[PDB]
Design a protein around this nucleic acid. Structure first.
Ligand SMILES: [Mg+2]
Lengths: 97, 135, 237, 67, 169, 190, 254, 79
RNA sequence: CGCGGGGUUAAGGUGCCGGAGUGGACGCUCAUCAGACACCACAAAAGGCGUUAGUACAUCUUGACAGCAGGACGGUGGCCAUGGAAGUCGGAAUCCGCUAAGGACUGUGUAACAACUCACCUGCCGAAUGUACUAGCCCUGAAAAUGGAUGGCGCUCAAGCGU
RNA sequence: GGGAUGGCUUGUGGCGGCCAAGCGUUCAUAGCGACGUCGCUUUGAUCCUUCGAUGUCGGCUCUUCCUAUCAUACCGAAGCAGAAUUCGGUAAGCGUUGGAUUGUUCACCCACUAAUAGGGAACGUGAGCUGGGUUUAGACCGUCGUGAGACAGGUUAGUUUUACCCUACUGAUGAACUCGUCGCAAUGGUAAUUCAGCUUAGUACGAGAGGAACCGCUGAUUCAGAUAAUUGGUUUUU
């Protein structure tokens, strides 16, 4: 018979299976859609997570309660030494992708 | 219009249903017993709770006798559970206390004993008009 | 606004500019819409729609027949009885229902179980059909009450129809004369179909040939009270 | 043909005339022929013709057919 | 076992089981006229009688206001009173002259003020506690009616400190 | 019942050139050209006479025979569109807030764009893009009138219906709130 | 305030359709003969109780929404008597309350019978009997429901007259300028026309004098005959003159 | 309805043996019952049924009626 | 009904799974989960502006059905009633004239009128139609709860239905 | 020793009379008969009439499904002025709560809320945990019985205690293709939800009381995925 009291699901089925990642480095599943009218640019970069710290921000958010006031926010520092470009891969379109 | 105020930022709720707070005005009541919180959501087994500036429904357990038979709207002006403001300041008061109001937010009493919270003062203009000190 | 303000606005400003043509087009599509409803609705909604449309066709046909026949009391009553609502008014001493479905004792009574052990005593029987217990009734003690006639199934009145006068009156029950299935059922006063009961006919105003007032007569139950919640009877006249 | 226009039954007093009106017109014309000396033919083309009532009233000694 | 449920033809089914004469009816009417109530007498066995012919009729005021509503509806229906096909033109008034209207209006105002004062003399409140509903449950009253159906004598017990308070009318 | 032969005829004016190939009808006149693919209907086209187009169905059911009337009316509407044109006059009416209608012609697409503002005091800007070949003009003879003209009756009437349907009064009594843009006249340009 | 918050009153057939659709669609419908008899009894008892509760809440809304003429100001009481025949008003609401009580009694009787019913067929017959008797009782209310819906619409469109405030009451014969005066001093949209009895109901407008709110009441005209010959249209004006403590402006055309 | 994008549970046309046997048994029982009711039927039935006749759209109906008159006169003369 | 070889059939089948026909003739049906082993129930004299075949009655070049252009009148604002009510809030009557035809009116409308519209008639046009039933096939004619069943794929001048 | 009604059901009563299109019948004018109709079953009252457990349910945790939709989204109609609604349609995407009450069919009250919809997968018997129907042995009271004892009953206390197997599920390795790096994407899963405030605007609308919405802006509720700068908590940093 039915549940006497309704309750939503614990957890999301979108993130199944709850297994270990197949690689240590994160995979870009999708890149932004190419527009040939745009100037040439790169879509991604790498860095190393160093830690986090605290800031004070001077907020300019009209309509908000903390507008023209100071707010304390958490921020994460990513150490980013410059990358080195060493290669070029070409991709064609096929009926299999 | 229900008594839940608009333009309130998220804060740590310190007073669930069943909590007895002090009565900070001179309406005659000495304490307020929470039985409901305005604007509370629906969730299984979760007790409704409110913070400073929230409206609750409270009965009087101790005080003037003709106040003891009704359920009054009240605004929580002080809480003892520490909470954070947007300037990064964590703070708390030494007691939990509220004031009896009507659903329009106007106070039953005429004076407030002790300080009130900035959230309560900014959300209810009559409490800011009847407060002697705002912290 | 006050009083007929929508009518005043209607007079001062008119309609929307497309209202007449729009209603004309909708009334024109109404036939296709009816056919789509007839062929596309499902379930109880479709059944109710079909029944309603059948009724509409019947009254439409009646109206057309009356318009075709445009160009073409029963019993004698006195003038003081004219224009009032009068009833229509329509050896072998056989009852109108000579035979009904027989009721076995297993259907008639159910076993009431007693005791605290897993094995229960089963000597009590509960009467599962409506009964008439009579006046000045006091229930037997529970230690000596084999037959249980529950209070919620007890009846005192019946809707009795007079075949000659064509009137149905609610009358008190005087006694149960004969249950056709069992003399035990007659003794218990069970009110089932085909049962002969005695009814109080004082309200019907029956006077005998000697001038006496007949206030008790016989009726036969013509329904199933256990299924209907009411006792319906016809006077044996 | 299941798909057809629903013919409207008019719940009004006046019915269609039929052949009886034609025979009545025949009999009226054939009985008004021997009673008069002249038979004029007149035309009212692309006209409202509601003044023929006034013409009939003014020529009360004549007979007018407009069938 | 399913029995044969059959009713034989019989002349007794078509006769009058109980009859009464007019003299007997008049005697019983006089008997109820001279009836008095005695607390020290008990009823042991009722007499089967046509009580609708012996009991006196209801009061004329009761018999008139019992039928006033249907009488008004028969005199003038709902559709002729108010609606798109209403034909009502004159109202029903309790006054006939201007002086009667003035007196009726001032009496109506006085009565309205008096009723307002009576209602005035007579935050939301908390719900009544469920303990004060005790003694009114369906199980308890099933028990009471079961005992009443079972018993011939009923001892109604009253506290001597509050007899009319504890009396169950 | 299957009918052996059914025939329809379309007269063609002298200033019209009609080319039908593989049931693709191209109609040319003074006002331009119109094109319609009618390959979803089984029909035989022919020239039965100078200036008459014949339509035949052989061994067709009643439905197939009846479709020829639709084809006849569609081709006649194409002919009327390339000779006289089609014109829909719409009127916008208001009670309190004047309806602000701006008509522009987009450069890269070539279609007209109609912007509607202040409809019952709303701050949103409604924008309707016309079908190609439809010209919209704010009238100067009368007050609060748009004129949509073209060769395609389908395009002109659909653009008029789009303008009519974008300005719907919502959640208000339509007996009291009469605001909107409605088609007032339909006819030919010439 | 007014009387615009009365919920709409359906006809008898619409009432039956609404209640039976609620019973059919807000409860489960599938019961099986092979189930336990307690389960079958619970199913049909729930059907009967839900039907009665829907009827009871609709009837109680109708009863508690309409004005109580015993509790009104005498002006409002006499105005409602002129407009709607207070006798018919009270008879209609009494019929509604009597039907509500009878439906509750039928529900209690058939629930008590369903406590003792022994099979699904008998339970079904008892449930259908209860629902049919309720439908018959609703069908016997055809004319009061139509009358009460009409009265509800008229009450919703009635103007709001405060009987204990500052008020000008304009009276007289027709065609003397009463509505012209009320239009000139207030914002009320009372029509002005040259024919007699243009105004057939009480109209009210408002004005400000020395920072105070005054209400002005335009009335239908009154003719010169005794009150037994006055119709309802003139008796609205007579009621206003008789029960409203006002400043009377009697208009005359010389 | 949203049947195309979101269809519901299909209705099975696959019968079961128990349902087939029950339907056949009930059909045979109904046949026997209507045979019994036809035997005990109280309704009046004509000895000779009302014959529909000759269709109007038959082209030779009139000459057939001419014939029918000819055999009735011939039988009257012979008898 | 012994163990085998060959031949021929019954019931049932021949689009593939599967041996045998995308066999032949004439038709019918398009289903938003058709139908293919149905007969019983739902279920009724049931509802369909689906599609075809019939039966009966009726109109029709003396012009039928549909349309378009016009007429749709006079006694008369018929009687009673109503603050008002003129065909059109109601109650009851419902006739005559002119007629080619027009109701003491079918609806919209007016406070009441006015005005429009319908019934009916004439002009234009042009040849077959209207109504009600019957028989087929198709749709609806009530359904819950894991994802599934004409055995499955699938099949639409069939690989469905009748012979 | 033997055992452990079902293509059922759903929304509209029964009895009695009358009418009745039609079906029959026209050597008998009977009989069936939908649609209906008529009889029985308080002037808004009363509150001094609650009418019988043989049939037993719960609660927790948790997953999914149905739609017969309570709310949210869109649409049709209503004297629907506005506001708030009512009736109905498509729709299961997403939610559907916190408590009191056992001198009792535990069902009804209270509040919060957008709303606090109804069911199935058990109850057409049935090993998760734990309370009532419920009932071994001890004991008491009431009824019956001469008694052993039994019950119309009421009360108290009271023994079942797997998993390491197969499968399913959740995770984790992995042989064969030399090892490794960078990738593709068949298929399976899939995610967000509701309210409030500022503005529009005291504007449209309204006699008055009152009183919206689109676009734009800012927060919060429920859910989901992460994280430890800060604040709390935790201390075998012994
Ligand atoms: Mg005037």
């Amino acid at each position: 018979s039915h549940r006497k009291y309704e309750a939503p699901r614990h957890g999301s089925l979108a993130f199944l299976p709850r297994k270990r990642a197949a690689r240590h480095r994160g995979r870009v599943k999708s890149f932004p859609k190419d527009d040939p009218k745009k100037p040439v640019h790169l879509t991604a970069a790498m860095g190393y997570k160093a830690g986090m710290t605290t800031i004070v921000r001077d907020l300019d958010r009209p309509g908000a309660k903390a507008h023209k006031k100071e707010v304390v926010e958490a921020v994460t520092i990513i150490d980013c030494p410059p990358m080195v470009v060493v290669g070029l891969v070409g991709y064609i379109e096929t009926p299999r992708g | 219009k229900r008594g839940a105020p608009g333009g309130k930022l998220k804060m740590t709720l310190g007073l669930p249903v069943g909590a007895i707070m002090n009565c900070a005005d001179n309406s005659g009541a000495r304490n307020l017993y929470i039985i409901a919180v305005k604007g509370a959501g629906a969730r299984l087994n979760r007790l409704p709770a409110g913070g400073v500036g929230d409206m609750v429904m409270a009965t009087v357990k101790k005080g003037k006798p003709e106040l003891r038979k009704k359920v009054h709207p009240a605004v929580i002006v002080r809480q003892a559970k520490p909470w954070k403001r947007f300037d990064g300041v964590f703070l708390y008061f030494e007691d939990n206390a509220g004031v009896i109001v009507n659903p329009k937010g106007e106070m039953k009493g005429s004076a407030i004993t002790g300080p009130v919270g900035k959230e309560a003062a900014e959300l209810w203009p009559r409490i800011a008009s009847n407060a002697g000190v705002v912290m | 606004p006050q009083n007929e303000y929508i009518e005043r606005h209607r007079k001062l400003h008119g309609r929307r500019l497309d209202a007449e043509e729009r209603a004309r087009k909708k009334a024109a599509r109404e036939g296709h819409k009816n056919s789509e409803n007839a062929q596309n609705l499902r379930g109880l909604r479709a059944k109710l729609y079909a029944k309603q449309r059948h009724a509409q066709k019947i009254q439409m046909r009646k109206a057309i027949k009356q318009h075709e026949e445009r160009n073409v009391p029963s019993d004698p009553i006195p003038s003081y009885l004219l224009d009032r609502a009068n009833p229509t008014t329509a050896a072998r001493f056989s009852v109108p229902i000579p035979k009904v479905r027989g009721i076995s004792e297993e259907e008639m009574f159910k076993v009431v179980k007693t005791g605290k052990k897993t094995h229960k005593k089963g000597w009590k029987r509960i009467v599962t059909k409506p009964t008439f217990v009579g006046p000045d009734f006091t229930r037997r003690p529970v230690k000596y009450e084999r037959f249980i006639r529950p209070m919620g199934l007890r009846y005192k009145k019946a809707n009795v129809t007079h075949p000659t006068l064509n009137v149905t009156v609610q009358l008190p029950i005087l006694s149960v004369k004969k249950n056709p299935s069992n003399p035990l059922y007659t003794q218990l006063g069970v009110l089932t179909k085909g049962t002969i009961i005695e009814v109080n006919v004082s309200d019907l105003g029956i006077v005998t040939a000697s001038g006496k007032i007949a206030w008790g007569r016989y009726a036969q139950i013509t329904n199933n009270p256990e299924n209907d919640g009411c006792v319906n009877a016809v006077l044996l006249v | 043909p299941k798909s057809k226009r629903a013919r409207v039954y008019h719940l009004t007093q006046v019915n269609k005339k039929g052949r009886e009106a034609k025979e009545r017109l025949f009999s009226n014309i054939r009985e008004t022929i021997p009673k008069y000396q002249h038979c004029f033919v007149f035309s009212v083309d692309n006209m409202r013709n509601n003044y023929l009532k006034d013409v009939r009233h003014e020529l009360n000694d004549c007979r007018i057919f407009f069938g | 076992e399913v029995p044969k449920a059959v009713i034989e033809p019989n002349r007794k089914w078509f006769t009058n089981t109980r009859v009464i004469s007019q003299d007997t009816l008049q005697s019983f009417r006089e008997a109820m006229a001279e009836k008095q109530k005695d607390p020290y007498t008990v009823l042991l066995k009722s007499n089967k009688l046509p009580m609708s012919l012996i009991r006196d009729g209801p009061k004329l005021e009761d018999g008139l206001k019992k039928h006033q509503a249907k009488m008004t509806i028969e005199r003038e229906p709902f559709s002729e009173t108010f609606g798109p096909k209403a034909q009502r033109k004159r109202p029903k008034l309790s006054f006939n002259t201007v002086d009667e209207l003035a007196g009726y209006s001032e009496q109506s105002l006085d009565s309205y003020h008096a009723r307002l004062e009576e209602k005035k003399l007579l935050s939301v409140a908390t719900a009544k506690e469920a303990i004060f509903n005790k003694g009114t449950s369906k199980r308890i009253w099933n028990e009471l009616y079961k005992v009443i159906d079972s018993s011939d004598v009923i001892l109604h017990v009253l506290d001597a400190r509050d007899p009319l308070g504890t009396r169950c009318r | 019942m299957r009918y052996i032969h059914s025939e329809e005829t379309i007269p063609v004016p002298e200033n019209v050139k009609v080319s039908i190939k593989s049931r693709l009808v191209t109609v040319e006149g003074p006002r331009g050209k119109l094109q319609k693919d009618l390959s979803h209907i089984a029909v035989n086209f022919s020239v039965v006479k100078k200036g008459v187009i014949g339509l035949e169905i052989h061994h067709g059911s009643r439905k197939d025979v009846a479709a020829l009337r639709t084809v006849r009316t569609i081709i006649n509407n194409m002919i009327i569109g390339v000779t006289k044109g089609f014109k829909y006059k719409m009127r916008y009416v208001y009670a309190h807030f004047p309806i602000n209608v701006n008509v522009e012609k987009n450069a890269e697409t070539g279609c007209y764009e109609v912007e509607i503002r202040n409809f019952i005091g709303e701050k949103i800007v409604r924008k309707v893009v016309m079908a190609p070949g439809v010209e919209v003009e704010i009238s100067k003879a009368q007050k609060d009138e748009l004129i949509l003209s073209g060769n395609s009756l389908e395009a002109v009437s659909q653009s008029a219906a789009d303008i009519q349907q974008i300005c719907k009064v919502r959640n208000k009594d339509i007996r009291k709130f009469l605001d909107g843009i409605y088609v007032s006249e339909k006819g030919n340009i010439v | 305030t007014g009387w615009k918050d009365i919920p709409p009153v359906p006809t008898a057939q619409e009432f039956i359709d609404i209640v039976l659709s609620r019973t059919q669609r807000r409860l489960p419908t599938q019961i099986r003969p092979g189930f336990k008899i307690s389960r079958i009894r619970a199913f049909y008892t729930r059907k009967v109780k839900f039907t009665q509760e829907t009827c009871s809440e609709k009837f109680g809304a109708i009863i508690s929404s309409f004005p109580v003429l015993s509790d009104q100001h005498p002006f409002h009481r006499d105005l409602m008597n002129i407009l709607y025949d207070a006798d018919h008003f009270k008879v209609a609401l009494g019929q509604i309350s009597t039907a509500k009580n009878l439906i509750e009694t039928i529900s209690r009787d058939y629930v008590r019978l369903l406590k003792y019913a022994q099979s699904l067929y008998q339970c079904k017959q008892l449930k259908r009997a209860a629902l049919g008797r309720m439908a018959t009782l609703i069908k016997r209310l055809k004319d009061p429901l139509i009358y009460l819906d009409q009265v509800r619409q008229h009450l919703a469109r009635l103007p709001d007259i405060n009987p204990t405030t500052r008020t000008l009451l304009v009276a007289g014969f027709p065609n003397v300028g009463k509505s012209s005066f009320v239009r000139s001093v207030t914002r009320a949209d009372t029509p002005v026309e040259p024919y007699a009895f243009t105004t057939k109901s009480l109209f009210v407008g408002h004005l400000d004098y020395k920072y105070l709110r005054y209400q002005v009441i335009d009335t239908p005209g009154i003719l010169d005959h005794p009150l037994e010959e006055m119709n309802t249209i003139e008796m609205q004006s007579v009621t206003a003159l008789a029960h409203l403590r006002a400043a009377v402006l009697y208009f005359m055309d010389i | 309805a949203g049947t195309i994008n979101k269809p519901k549970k299909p209705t099975s046309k696959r019968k079961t043996t128990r349902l087939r046997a029950k339907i056949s048994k009930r059909a045979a029982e109904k046949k026997r019952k209507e045979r019994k009711l036809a035997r005990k039927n109280p309704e009046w039935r004509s000895k000779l049924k009302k014959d529909p006749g000759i269709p109007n759209l038959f082209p030779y109906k009139e000459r057939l009626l001419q014939q029918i008159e000819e055999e009735r006169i011939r039988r009257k003369e012979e008898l």
